[PDB]
Amino acid sequence: RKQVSDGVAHIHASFNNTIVTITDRQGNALGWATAGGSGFRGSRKSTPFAAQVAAERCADAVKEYGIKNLEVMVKGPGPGRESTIRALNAAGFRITNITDVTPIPHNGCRPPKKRRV
């Protein structure tokens, strides 16, 4: 189906999971994969290896569109914030730009109370 020359990889990396979404330059999602959906649950769900596997499955998902160049936008603090980028490179996409888009409040709303574990 419709060819796309280049797109953005959005990496959303929390402490609990990693989601990799490919989208066209305009933000229409073309495909996605997640660490939790790749068969890793619990402690393994948030490891850089599981994020690597998620990125690989996402790259395998967009093979229809034939994308060759992409931009990487990384969000959040979790592990696998970087290993996904290595995996995307190994998949053969030309990583053109890298950017961090993590939301920063200028104070803003009150966060939750601290855990007394």
């Binding site: 890793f40 402690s43 393994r44 490891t47 290896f49 599981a50």
Partner: protein, 151 residues
């Protein structure tokens, strides 16, 4: 030990084929210090494996051992509140030790009419990439790759 590191004790090569590896195999099959009994069993098994295979004794033994030596093992690694199985690249001397131990313990529990014949059968199966020693190697590799996420 926590203070020391130990230099290896001197082994003597097997008197008939000149192999220290076969000497280790004998030393593992040996029970109660009955060295000569183990030697007789090993020689009978090796000659019957040789005539089955159309190979020299040490050649058949080596090609069997190749099929069962593991490449990785799983080791318990502690963390400040948890323990994880982690795969570790086992070194060659421990590879040989493991393969010989697995062959011997697999043969020991076979039903065949004599230990020499049990051993010959188990070495044939190992060379044929089959049976209990091989499934032992296999499931070790399965566990390692199942834990690969923590490596």
């Amino acid at each position: 030990p926590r203070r020391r590191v130990i230099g290896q004790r001197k082994i003597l090569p097997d008197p008939k084929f000149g192999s220290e590896l076969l000497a280790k195999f004998v030393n593992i099959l040996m029970v109660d210090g009955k060295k000569s009994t183990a030697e007789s069993i090993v020689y009978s098994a090796l000659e019957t494996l040789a005539q089955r295979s159309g190979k020299s004794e040490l050649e058949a033994f080596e090609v069997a051992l190749e099929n069962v030596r593991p490449t990785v093992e799983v080791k318990s690694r502690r963390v400040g509140g948890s323990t994880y199985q982690v795969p570790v690249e086992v070194r060659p001397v421990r590879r040989n030790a493991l393969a010989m131990r697995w062959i011997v313990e697999a043969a020991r529990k076979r039903g065949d009419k004599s230990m020499a014949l049990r051993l010959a059968n188990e070495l044939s199966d190992a060379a044929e990439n089959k049976g209990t020693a091989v499934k032992k190697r296999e499931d070790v590799h399965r566990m390692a790759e199942a834990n690969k996420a923590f490596a």
